[PDB]
Design an enzyme around this catalytic site. Structure first.
Site, mmCIF file in Angstrom:
data_model
loop_
_atom_site.group_PDB
_atom_site.id
_atom_site.type_symbol
_atom_site.label_atom_id
_atom_site.label_comp_id
_atom_site.label_asym_id
_atom_site.label_seq_id
_atom_site.Cartn_x
_atom_site.Cartn_y
_atom_site.Cartn_z
ATOM 1 N N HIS A 83 -7.228 8.218 -1.022
ATOM 2 C CA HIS A 83 -7.921 9.471 -0.772
ATOM 3 C C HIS A 83 -7.385 10.023 0.531
ATOM 4 O O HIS A 83 -6.433 9.478 1.095
ATOM 5 C CB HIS A 83 -9.429 9.282 -0.750
ATOM 6 N N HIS A 85 -8.079 10.338 3.752
ATOM 7 C CA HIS A 85 -8.300 10.009 5.165
ATOM 8 C C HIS A 85 -7.122 9.219 5.751
ATOM 9 O O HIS A 85 -6.458 8.451 5.053
ATOM 10 C CB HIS A 85 -9.605 9.199 5.379
ATOM 11 N N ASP A 87 -6.732 6.517 7.057
ATOM 12 C CA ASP A 87 -6.575 5.094 6.755
ATOM 13 C C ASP A 87 -5.885 4.908 5.429
ATOM 14 O O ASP A 87 -5.579 3.771 5.040
ATOM 15 C CB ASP A 87 -7.930 4.287 6.844
ATOM 16 N N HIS A 148 -16.543 7.611 -2.596
ATOM 17 C CA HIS A 148 -16.445 7.607 -1.137
ATOM 18 C C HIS A 148 -16.142 9.017 -0.654
ATOM 19 O O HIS A 148 -16.775 9.535 0.274
ATOM 20 C CB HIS A 148 -15.367 6.628 -0.687
ATOM 21 N N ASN A 179 -20.608 6.188 7.710
ATOM 22 C CA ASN A 179 -20.282 7.609 7.755
ATOM 23 C C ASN A 179 -20.047 8.061 6.324
ATOM 24 O O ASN A 179 -19.031 7.701 5.705
ATOM 25 C CB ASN A 179 -19.041 7.920 8.604
HETATM 26 N N1 LIG Z 1 -19.938 -3.158 7.997
HETATM 27 C C1 LIG Z 1 -19.054 -1.981 7.996
HETATM 28 N N2 LIG Z 1 -19.465 -0.831 8.495
HETATM 29 C C2 LIG Z 1 -18.543 0.143 8.439
HETATM 30 C C3 LIG Z 1 -18.886 1.379 8.943
HETATM 31 C C4 LIG Z 1 -17.993 2.399 8.885
HETATM 32 C C5 LIG Z 1 -16.754 2.220 8.330
HETATM 33 C C6 LIG Z 1 -16.019 3.554 8.430
HETATM 34 N N3 LIG Z 1 -14.666 3.745 7.983
HETATM 35 C C7 LIG Z 1 -13.639 3.894 8.794
HETATM 36 C C8 LIG Z 1 -12.539 4.128 7.986
HETATM 37 N N4 LIG Z 1 -12.967 4.157 6.738
HETATM 38 C C9 LIG Z 1 -14.259 3.951 6.753
HETATM 39 C C10 LIG Z 1 -15.026 3.869 5.458
HETATM 40 O O1 LIG Z 1 -16.308 3.889 5.376
HETATM 41 O O2 LIG Z 1 -14.225 3.716 4.479
HETATM 42 C C11 LIG Z 1 -16.363 0.976 7.804
HETATM 43 C C12 LIG Z 1 -17.285 -0.076 7.875
HETATM 44 S S1 LIG Z 1 -17.378 -1.750 7.405
HETATM 45 ZN ZN LIG Z 2 -11.887 3.977 4.763
HETATM 46 ZN ZN LIG Z 3 -12.294 7.475 3.616
#
Ligand SMILES: Nc1nc2ccc(Cn3ccnc3C(=O)O)cc2s1
Ligand SMILES: [Zn+2]
Ligand SMILES: [Zn+2]
Length: 231
Positions: A83, A85, A87, A148, A179
């Protein structure tokens, strides 16, 4: 034993053997006050390698290429971001320079552009509507619907029964939705029903962040999502 975020300095990439000719790739990046781990996938494509998702970053993705030459020794020839983002797409510029043809759905490309992120070169078609499936070399790419985010893809390696869920599949230890800026909470449980229809065989399921699991991660992710809207 699968590496955790504590073990992976920002700028390093680890490779983990899921099954024969199947690896996940783990890196780490800073975000919202912390450093998070992030998973991608690698698939032997004949005498070449198919990558799924960047390592969250330019310098990281280049440490991914280096660890893949060091440890596998075949060339990444294609990549697929799942997707929009960073990452998933941060590092495409690096992959481009490195010889890799980079692909994403048509939505994924436009969304990143608006958000200022990097842009996979080529467009993937056949993926426009909830539940489409197309064949990309040694994998099947699957649009289960809004989840997501509204563009996310999942990937299935049939020869190994590995399903790569991306960020629309959470790990078991995750209990806070997080988020959910760009997610569709109403449709996300239904999207996960489709995955479970189209991939009942899955042996291992790889979340976007954290430890792999089984198909349990699906009813987990759904319980996590629905809890978030009843409060
Ligand atoms: N226990 C965890 N809490 C969280 C909170 C936010 C994220 C946020 N995030 C950053 C990049 N992708 C995401 C995403 O949500 O894909 C991951 C985790 S793993
Ligand atoms: Zn992510
Ligand atoms: Zn994402």
């Amino acid at each position: 034993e699968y590496p955790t975020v504590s073990e992976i300095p920002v700028g390093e990439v680890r490779l983990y053997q899921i099954a024969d000719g199947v690896w996940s790739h783990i890196a780490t990046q800073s975000f919202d006050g912390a450093v998070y781990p992030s998973n991608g996938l690698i698939v032997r494509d004949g005498d070449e390698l198919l990558l799924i998702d960047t390592a969250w970053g330019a310098k990281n993705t280049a440490a991914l290429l280096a660890e893949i030459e060091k440890q596998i020794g075949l060339p990444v020839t294609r990549a697929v971001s799942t997707h929009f983002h960073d990452d998933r797409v941060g590092g495409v510029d690096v992959l481009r320079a490195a010889g890799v043809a980079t692909y994403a759905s048509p939505s994924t490309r436009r969304l990143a552009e608006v958000e200022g992120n990097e842009i996979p070169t080529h467009s993937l078609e056949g993926l426009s509507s909830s539940g489409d499936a197309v064949r990309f070399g040694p994998v099947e790419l699957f649009y289960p619907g809004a989840a997501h985010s509204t563009d996310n893809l999942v990937v299935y390696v049939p020869s190994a029964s590995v399903l790569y869920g991306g960020c629309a599949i959470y790990e078991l230890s995750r209990t806070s939705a997080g988020n959910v800026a760009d997610a569709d909470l109403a449709e996300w449980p239904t999207s996960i029903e489709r995955i479970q229809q189209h991939y009942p065989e899955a042996q291992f399921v790889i979340p976007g962040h954290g430890l792999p699991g089984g198909l349990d991660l699906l009813k987990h992710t759904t319980n996590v999502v629905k809890a978030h809207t009843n409060r």
